[PDB]
mmCIF file with all atom_site columns, C-alpha atoms and ligand atoms in Angstrom:
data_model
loop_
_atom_site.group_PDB
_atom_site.id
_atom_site.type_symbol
_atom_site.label_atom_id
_atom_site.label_alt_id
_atom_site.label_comp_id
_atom_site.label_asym_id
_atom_site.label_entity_id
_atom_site.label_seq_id
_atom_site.pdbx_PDB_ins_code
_atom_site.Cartn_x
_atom_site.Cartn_y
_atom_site.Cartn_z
_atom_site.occupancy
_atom_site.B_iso_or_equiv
_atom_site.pdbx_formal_charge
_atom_site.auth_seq_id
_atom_site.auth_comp_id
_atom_site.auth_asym_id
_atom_site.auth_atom_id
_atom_site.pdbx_PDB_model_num
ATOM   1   C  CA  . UNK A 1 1  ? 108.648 99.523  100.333 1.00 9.41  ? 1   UNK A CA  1
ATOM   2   C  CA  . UNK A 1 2  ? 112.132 100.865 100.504 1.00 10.57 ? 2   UNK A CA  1
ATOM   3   C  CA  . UNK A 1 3  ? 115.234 99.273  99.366  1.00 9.16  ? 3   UNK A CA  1
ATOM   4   C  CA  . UNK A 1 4  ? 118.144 100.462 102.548 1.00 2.57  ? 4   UNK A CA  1
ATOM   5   C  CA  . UNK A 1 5  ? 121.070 99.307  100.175 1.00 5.07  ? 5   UNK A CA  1
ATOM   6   C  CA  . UNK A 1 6  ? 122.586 102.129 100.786 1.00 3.22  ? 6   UNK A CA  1
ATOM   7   C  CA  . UNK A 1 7  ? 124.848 101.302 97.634  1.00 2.98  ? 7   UNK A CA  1
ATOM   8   C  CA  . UNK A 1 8  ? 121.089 101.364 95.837  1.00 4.02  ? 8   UNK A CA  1
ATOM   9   C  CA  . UNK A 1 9  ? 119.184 103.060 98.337  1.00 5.57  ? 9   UNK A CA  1
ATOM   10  C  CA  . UNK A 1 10 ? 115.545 104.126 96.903  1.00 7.37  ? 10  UNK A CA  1
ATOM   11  C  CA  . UNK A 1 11 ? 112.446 103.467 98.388  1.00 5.94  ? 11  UNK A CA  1
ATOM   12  C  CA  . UNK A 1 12 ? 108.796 103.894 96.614  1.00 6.73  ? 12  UNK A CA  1
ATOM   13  C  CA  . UNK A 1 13 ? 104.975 104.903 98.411  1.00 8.97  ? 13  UNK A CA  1
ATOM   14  C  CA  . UNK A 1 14 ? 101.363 104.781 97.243  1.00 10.31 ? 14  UNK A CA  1
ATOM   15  C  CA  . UNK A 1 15 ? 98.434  105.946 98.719  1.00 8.46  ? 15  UNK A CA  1
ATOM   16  C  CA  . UNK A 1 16 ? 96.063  103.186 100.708 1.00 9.26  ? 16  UNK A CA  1
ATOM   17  C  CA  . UNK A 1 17 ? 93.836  103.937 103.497 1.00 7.46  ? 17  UNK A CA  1
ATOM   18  C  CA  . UNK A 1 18 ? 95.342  100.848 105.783 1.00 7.71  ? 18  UNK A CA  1
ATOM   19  C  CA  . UNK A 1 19 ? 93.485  100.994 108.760 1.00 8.94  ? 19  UNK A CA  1
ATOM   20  C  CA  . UNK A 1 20 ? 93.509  98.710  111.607 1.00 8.72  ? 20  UNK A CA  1
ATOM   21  C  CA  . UNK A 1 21 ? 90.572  96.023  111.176 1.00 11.32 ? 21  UNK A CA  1
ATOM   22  C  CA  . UNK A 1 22 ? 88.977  93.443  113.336 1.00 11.32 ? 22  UNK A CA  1
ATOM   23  C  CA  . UNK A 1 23 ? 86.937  90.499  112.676 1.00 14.40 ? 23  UNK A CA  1
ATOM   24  C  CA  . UNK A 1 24 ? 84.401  89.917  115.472 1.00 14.02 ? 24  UNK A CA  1
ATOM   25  C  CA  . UNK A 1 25 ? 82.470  92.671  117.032 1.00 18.22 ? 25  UNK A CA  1
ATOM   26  C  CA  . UNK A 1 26 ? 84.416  94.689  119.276 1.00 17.30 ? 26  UNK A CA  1
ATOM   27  C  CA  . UNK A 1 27 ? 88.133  96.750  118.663 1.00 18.17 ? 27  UNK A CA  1
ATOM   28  C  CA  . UNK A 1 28 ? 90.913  95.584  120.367 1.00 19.71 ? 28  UNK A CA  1
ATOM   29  C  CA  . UNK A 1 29 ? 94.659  96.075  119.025 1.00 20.65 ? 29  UNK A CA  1
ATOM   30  C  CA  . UNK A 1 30 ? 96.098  92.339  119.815 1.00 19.51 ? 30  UNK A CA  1
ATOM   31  C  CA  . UNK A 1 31 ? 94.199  89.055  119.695 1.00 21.19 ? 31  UNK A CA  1
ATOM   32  C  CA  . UNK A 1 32 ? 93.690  88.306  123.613 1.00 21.73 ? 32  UNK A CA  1
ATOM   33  C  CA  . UNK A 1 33 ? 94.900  84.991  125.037 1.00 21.69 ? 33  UNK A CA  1
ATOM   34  C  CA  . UNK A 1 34 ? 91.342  83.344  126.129 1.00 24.59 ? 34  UNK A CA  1
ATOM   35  C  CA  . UNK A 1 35 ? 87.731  84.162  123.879 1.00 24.84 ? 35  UNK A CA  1
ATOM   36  C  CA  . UNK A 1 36 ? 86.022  82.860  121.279 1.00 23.39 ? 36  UNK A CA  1
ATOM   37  C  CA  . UNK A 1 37 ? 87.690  80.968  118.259 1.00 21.92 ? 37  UNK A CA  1
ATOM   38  C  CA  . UNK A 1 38 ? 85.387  82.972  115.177 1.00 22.39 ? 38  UNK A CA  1
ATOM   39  C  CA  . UNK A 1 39 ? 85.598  82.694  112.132 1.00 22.19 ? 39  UNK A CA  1
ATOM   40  C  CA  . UNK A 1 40 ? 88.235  85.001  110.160 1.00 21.86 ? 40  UNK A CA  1
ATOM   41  C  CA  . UNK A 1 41 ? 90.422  85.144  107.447 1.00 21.75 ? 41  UNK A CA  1
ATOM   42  C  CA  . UNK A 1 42 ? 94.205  85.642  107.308 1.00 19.56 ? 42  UNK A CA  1
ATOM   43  C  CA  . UNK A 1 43 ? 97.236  85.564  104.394 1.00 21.04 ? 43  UNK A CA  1
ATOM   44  C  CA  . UNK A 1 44 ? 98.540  82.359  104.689 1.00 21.37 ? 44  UNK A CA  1
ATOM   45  C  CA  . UNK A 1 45 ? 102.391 82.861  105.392 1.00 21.28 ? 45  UNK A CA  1
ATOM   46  C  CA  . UNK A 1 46 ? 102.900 79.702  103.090 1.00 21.98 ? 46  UNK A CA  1
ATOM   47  C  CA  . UNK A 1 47 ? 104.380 81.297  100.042 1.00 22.09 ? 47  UNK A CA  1
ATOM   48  C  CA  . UNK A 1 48 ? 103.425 78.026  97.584  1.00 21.53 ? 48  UNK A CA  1
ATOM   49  C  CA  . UNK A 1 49 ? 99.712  78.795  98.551  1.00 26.52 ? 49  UNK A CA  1
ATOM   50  C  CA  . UNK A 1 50 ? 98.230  80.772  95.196  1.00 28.83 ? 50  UNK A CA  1
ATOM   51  C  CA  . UNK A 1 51 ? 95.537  83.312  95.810  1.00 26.07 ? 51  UNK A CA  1
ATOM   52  C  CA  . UNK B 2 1  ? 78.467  71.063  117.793 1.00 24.68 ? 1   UNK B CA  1
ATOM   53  C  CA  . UNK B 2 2  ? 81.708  73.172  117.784 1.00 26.94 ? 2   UNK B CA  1
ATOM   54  C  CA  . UNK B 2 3  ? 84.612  73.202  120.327 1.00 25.78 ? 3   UNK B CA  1
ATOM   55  C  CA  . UNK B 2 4  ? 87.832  75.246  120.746 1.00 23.02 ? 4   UNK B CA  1
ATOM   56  C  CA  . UNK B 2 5  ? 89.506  74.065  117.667 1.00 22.70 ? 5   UNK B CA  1
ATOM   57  C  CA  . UNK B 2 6  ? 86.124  74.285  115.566 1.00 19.65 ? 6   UNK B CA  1
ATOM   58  C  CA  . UNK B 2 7  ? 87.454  70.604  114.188 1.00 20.34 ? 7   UNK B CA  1
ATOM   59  C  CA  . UNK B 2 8  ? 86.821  66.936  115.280 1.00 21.48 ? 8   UNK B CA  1
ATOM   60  C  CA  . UNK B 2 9  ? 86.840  65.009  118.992 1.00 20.23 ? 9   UNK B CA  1
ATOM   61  C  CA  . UNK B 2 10 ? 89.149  62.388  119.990 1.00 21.13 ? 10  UNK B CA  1
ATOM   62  C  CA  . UNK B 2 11 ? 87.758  59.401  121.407 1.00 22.71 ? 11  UNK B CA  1
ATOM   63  C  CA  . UNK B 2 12 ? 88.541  60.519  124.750 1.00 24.33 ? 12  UNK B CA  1
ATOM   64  C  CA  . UNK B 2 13 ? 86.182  62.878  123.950 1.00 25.21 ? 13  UNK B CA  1
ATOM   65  C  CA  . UNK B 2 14 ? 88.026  66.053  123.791 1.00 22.53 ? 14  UNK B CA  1
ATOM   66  C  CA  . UNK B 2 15 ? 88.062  68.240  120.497 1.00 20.43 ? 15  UNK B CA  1
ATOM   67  C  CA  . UNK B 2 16 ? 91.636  68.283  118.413 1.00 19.98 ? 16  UNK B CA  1
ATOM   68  C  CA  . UNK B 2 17 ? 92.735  69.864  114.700 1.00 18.99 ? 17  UNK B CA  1
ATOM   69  C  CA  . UNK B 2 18 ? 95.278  68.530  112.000 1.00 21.87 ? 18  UNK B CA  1
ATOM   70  C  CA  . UNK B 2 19 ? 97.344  71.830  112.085 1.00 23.44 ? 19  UNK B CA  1
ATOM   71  C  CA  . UNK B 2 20 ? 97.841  71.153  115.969 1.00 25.08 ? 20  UNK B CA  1
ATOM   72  C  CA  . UNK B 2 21 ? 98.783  67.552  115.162 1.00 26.88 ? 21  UNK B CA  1
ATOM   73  C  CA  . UNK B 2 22 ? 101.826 69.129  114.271 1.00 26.46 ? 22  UNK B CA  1
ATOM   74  C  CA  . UNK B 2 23 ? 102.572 72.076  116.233 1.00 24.08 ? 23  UNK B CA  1
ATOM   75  C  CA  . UNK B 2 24 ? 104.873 69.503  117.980 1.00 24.85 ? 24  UNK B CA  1
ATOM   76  C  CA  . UNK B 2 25 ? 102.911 69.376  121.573 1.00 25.76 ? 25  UNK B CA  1
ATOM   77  C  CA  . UNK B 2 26 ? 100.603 66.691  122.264 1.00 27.84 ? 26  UNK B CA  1
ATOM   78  C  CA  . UNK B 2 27 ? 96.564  67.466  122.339 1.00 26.60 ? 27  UNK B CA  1
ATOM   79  C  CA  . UNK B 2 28 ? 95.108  64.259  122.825 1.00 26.94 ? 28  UNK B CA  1
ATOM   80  C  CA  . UNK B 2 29 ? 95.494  60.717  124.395 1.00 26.43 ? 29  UNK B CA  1
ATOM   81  C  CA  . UNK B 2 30 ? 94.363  59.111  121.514 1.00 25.69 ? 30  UNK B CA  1
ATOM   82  C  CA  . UNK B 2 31 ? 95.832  59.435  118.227 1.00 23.85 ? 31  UNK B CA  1
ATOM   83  C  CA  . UNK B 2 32 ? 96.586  62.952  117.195 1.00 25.42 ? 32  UNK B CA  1
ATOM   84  C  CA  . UNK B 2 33 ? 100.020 64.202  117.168 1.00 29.31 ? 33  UNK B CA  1
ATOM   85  C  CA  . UNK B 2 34 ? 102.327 61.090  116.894 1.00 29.18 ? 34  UNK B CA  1
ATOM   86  C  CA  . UNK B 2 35 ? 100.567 60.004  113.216 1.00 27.43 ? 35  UNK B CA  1
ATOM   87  C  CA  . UNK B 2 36 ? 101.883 61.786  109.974 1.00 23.62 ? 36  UNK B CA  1
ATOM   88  C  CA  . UNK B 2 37 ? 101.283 65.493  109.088 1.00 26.58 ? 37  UNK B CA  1
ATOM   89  C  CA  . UNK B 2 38 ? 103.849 67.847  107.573 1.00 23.25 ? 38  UNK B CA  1
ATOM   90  C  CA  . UNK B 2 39 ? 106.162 68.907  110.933 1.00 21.97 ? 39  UNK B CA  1
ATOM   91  C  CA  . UNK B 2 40 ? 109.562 70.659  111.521 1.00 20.94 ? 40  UNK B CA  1
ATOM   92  C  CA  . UNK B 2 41 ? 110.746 67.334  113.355 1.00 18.88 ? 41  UNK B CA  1
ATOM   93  C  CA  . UNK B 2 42 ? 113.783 68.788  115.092 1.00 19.63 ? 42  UNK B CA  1
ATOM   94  C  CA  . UNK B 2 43 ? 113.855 72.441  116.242 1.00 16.07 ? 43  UNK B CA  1
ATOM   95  C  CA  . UNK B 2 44 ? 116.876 74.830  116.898 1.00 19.37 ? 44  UNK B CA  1
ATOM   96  C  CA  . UNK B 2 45 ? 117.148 72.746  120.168 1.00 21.00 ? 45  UNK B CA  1
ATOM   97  C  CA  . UNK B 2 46 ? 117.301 68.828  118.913 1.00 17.56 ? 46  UNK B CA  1
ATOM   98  C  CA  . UNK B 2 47 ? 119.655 66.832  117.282 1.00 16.69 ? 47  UNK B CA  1
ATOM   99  C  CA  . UNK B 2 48 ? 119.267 64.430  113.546 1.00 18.09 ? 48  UNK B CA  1
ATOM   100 C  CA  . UNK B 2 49 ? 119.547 60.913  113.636 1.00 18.31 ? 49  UNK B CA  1
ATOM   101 C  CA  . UNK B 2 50 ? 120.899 59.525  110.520 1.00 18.98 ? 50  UNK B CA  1
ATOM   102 C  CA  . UNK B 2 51 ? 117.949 57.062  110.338 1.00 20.01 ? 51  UNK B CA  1
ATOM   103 C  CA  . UNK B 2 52 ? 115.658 60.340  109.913 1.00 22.15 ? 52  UNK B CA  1
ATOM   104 C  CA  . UNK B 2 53 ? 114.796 60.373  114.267 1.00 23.10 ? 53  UNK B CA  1
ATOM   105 C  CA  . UNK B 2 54 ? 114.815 63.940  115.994 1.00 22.51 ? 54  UNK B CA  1
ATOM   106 C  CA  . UNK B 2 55 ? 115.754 64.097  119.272 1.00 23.87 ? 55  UNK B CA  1
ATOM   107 C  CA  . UNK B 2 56 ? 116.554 66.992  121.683 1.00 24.21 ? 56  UNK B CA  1
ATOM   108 C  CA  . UNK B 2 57 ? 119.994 67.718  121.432 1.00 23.06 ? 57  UNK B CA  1
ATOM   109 C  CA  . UNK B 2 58 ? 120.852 67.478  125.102 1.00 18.97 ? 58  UNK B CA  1
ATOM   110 C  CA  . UNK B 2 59 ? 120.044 64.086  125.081 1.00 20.31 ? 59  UNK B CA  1
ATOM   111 C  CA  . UNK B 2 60 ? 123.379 63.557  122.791 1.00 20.67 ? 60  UNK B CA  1
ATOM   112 C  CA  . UNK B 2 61 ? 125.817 61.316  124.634 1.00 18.63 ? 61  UNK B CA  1
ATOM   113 C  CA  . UNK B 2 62 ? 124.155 61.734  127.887 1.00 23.54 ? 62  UNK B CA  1
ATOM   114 C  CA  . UNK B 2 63 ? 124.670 57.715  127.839 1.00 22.00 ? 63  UNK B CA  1
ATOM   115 C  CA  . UNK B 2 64 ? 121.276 56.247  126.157 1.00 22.71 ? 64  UNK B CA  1
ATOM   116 C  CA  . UNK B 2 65 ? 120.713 55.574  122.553 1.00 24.10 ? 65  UNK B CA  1
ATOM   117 C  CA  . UNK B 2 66 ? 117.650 57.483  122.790 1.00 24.77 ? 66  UNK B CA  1
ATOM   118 C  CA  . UNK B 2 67 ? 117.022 57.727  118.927 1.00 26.09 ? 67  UNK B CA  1
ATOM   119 C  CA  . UNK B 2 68 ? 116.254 54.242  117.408 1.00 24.25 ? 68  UNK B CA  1
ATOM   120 C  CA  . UNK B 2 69 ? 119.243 54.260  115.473 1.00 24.40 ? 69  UNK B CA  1
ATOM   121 C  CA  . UNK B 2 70 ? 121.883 55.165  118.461 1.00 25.80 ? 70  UNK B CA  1
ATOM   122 C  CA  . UNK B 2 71 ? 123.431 58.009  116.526 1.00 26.59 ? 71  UNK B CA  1
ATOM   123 C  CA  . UNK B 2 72 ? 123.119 60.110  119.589 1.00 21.97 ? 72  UNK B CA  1
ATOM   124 C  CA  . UNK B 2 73 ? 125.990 57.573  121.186 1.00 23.20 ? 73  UNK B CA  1
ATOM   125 C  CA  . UNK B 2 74 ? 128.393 57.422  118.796 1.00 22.77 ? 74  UNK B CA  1
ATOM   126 C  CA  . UNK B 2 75 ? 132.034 57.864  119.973 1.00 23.80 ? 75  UNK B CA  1
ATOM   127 C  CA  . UNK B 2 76 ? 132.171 61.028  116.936 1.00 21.07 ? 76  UNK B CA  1
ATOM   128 C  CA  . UNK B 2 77 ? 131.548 63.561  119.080 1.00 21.19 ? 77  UNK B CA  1
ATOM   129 C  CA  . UNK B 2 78 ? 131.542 61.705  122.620 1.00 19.36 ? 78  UNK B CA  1
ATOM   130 C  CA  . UNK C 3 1  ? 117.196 118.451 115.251 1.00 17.88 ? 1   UNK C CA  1
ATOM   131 C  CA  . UNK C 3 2  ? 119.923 116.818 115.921 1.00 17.09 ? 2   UNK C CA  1
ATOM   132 C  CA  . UNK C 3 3  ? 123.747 115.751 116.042 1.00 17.00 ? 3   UNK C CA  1
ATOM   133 C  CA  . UNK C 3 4  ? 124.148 111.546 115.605 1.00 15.63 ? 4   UNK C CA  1
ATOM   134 C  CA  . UNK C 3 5  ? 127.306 111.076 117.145 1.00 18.57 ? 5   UNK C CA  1
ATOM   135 C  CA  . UNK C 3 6  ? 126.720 108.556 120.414 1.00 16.27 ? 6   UNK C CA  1
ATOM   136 C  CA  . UNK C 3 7  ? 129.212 110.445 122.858 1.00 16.44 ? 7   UNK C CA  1
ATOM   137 C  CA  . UNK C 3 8  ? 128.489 113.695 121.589 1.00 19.55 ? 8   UNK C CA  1
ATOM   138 C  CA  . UNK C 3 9  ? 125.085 113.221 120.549 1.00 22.09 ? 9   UNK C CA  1
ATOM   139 C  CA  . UNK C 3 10 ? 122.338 116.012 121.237 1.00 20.76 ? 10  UNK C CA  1
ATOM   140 C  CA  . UNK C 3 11 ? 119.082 117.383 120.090 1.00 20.30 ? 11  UNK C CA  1
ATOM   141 C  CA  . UNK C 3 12 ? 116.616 120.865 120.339 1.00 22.04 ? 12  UNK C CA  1
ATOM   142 C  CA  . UNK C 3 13 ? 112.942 120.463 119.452 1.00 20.68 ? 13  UNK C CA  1
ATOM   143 C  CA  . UNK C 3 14 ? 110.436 123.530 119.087 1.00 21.54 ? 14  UNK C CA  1
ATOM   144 C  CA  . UNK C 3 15 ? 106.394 123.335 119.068 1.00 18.33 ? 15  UNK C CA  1
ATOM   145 C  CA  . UNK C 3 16 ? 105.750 123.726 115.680 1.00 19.11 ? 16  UNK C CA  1
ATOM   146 C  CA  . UNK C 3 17 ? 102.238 122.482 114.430 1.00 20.35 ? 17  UNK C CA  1
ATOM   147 C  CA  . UNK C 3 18 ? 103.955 121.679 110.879 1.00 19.70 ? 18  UNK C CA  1
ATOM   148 C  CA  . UNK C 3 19 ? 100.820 119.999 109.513 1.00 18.75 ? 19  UNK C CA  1
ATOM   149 C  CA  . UNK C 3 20 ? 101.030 118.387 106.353 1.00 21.29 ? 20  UNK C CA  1
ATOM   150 C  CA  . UNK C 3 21 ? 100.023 121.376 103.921 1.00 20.59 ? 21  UNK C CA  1
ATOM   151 C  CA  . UNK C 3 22 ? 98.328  120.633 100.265 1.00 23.81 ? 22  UNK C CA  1
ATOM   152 C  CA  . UNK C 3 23 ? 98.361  123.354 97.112  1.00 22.80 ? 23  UNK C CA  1
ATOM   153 C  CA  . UNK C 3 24 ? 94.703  122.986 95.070  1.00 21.31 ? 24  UNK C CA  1
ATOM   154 C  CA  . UNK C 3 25 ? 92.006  122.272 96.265  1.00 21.79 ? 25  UNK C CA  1
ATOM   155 C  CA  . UNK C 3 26 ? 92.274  118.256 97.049  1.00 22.66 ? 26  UNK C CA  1
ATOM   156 C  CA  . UNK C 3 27 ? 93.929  116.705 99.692  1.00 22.13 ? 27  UNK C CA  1
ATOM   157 C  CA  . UNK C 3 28 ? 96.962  114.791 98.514  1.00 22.85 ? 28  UNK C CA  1
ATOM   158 C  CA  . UNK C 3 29 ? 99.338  112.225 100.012 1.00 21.34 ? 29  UNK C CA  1
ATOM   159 C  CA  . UNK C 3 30 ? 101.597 112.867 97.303  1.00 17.64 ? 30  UNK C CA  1
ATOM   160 C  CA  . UNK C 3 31 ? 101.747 114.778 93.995  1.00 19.70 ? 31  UNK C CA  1
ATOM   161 C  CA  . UNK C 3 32 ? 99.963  112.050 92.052  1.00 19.05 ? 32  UNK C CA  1
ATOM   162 C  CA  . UNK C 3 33 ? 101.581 110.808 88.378  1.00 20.76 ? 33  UNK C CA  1
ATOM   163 C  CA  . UNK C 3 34 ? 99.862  113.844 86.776  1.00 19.83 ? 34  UNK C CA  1
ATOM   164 C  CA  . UNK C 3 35 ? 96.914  116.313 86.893  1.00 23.45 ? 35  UNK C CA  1
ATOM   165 C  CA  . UNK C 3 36 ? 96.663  119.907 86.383  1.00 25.94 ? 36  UNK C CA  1
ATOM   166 C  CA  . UNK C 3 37 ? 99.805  122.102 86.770  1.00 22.68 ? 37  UNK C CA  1
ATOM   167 C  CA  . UNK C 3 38 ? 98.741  124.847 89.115  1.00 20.12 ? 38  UNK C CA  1
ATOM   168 C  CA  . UNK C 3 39 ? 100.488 127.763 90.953  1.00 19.50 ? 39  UNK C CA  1
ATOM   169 C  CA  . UNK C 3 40 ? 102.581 126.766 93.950  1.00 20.94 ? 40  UNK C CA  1
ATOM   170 C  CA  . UNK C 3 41 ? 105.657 128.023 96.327  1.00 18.53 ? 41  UNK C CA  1
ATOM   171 C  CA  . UNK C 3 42 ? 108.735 125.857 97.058  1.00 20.75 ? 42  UNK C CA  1
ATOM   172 C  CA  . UNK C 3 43 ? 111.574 126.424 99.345  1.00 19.83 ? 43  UNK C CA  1
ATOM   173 C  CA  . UNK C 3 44 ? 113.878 126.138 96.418  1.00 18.52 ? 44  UNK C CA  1
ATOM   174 C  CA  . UNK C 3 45 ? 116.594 123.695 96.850  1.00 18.52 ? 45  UNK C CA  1
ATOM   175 C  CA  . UNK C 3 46 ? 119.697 125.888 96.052  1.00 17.94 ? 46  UNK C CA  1
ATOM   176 C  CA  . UNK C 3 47 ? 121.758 127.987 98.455  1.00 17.96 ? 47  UNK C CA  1
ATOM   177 C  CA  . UNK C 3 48 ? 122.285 130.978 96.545  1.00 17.26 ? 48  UNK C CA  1
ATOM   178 C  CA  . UNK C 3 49 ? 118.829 132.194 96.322  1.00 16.16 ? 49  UNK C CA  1
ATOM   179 C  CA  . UNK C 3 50 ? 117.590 134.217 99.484  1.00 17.84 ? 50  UNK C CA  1
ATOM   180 C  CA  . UNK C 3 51 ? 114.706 134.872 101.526 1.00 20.45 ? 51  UNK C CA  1
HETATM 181 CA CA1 . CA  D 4 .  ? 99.403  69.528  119.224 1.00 20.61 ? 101 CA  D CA1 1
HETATM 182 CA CA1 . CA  D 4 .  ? 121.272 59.822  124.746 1.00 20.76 ? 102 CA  D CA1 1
#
């Protein structure tokens, strides 16, 4: 996360193994159009949602 | 069983969801998208009515009240 | 390397396998908050000393 103020320009880094992931059984690196709706989990974008 | 929306069938028996009920494009014949869900009624592209309507801007004063409560008409900006 | 200036812009590039390097005997990221002080070389930061 980096803050590009410039004025306040800092920025900050941990370590985390993110790696790409996939639900379903087989890698691909974007969704395709047409297949099969499965089951998966996402973040909801809706910030009022509480995790 | 399931269908492409893993949610219910409309009586024309095609399969539908509540978050497409309000992606503002129509799935179904038969109820669906014009009864109340939570929506972004107008997009960049429409136009408020002052009686709460949405209504794609380019239909402002093209000559028909074409939200219910004519504000698209008025003589404000036509 | 390179000079940001648009018009007069230019670059050089050499093949140099500068892999990311670790003193001790873990693999690091980064330095981590704290752990034991070992023996190490730095480029130091300041002009006047020489190579
Ligand atoms: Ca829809
Ligand atoms: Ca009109």
């Amino acid at each position: 996360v980096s803050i590009t103020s410039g004025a306040s320009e800092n920025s900050c880094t941990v370590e985390k193994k993110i790696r790409r992931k996939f639900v379903g059984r087989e890698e691909y690196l974007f969704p395709p159009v047409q297949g099969k709706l499965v089951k998966c989990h996402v973040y909801d974008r809706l910030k009022e949602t509480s995790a | 069983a399931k269908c492409e929306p893993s949610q219910f069938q409309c009586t024309n028996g095609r399969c539908i969801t509540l978050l497409w009920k309000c992606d503002g494009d129509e799935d179904c014949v038969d109820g669906s998208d014009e009864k109340n869900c939570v929506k972004k009624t107008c997009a960049e592209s429409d136009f408020v009515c002052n009686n709460g309507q949405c209504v794609p801007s380019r239909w402002k004063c093209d000559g028909d009240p074409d939200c219910e409560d004519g504000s698209d008409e008025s003589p404000e900006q036509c």
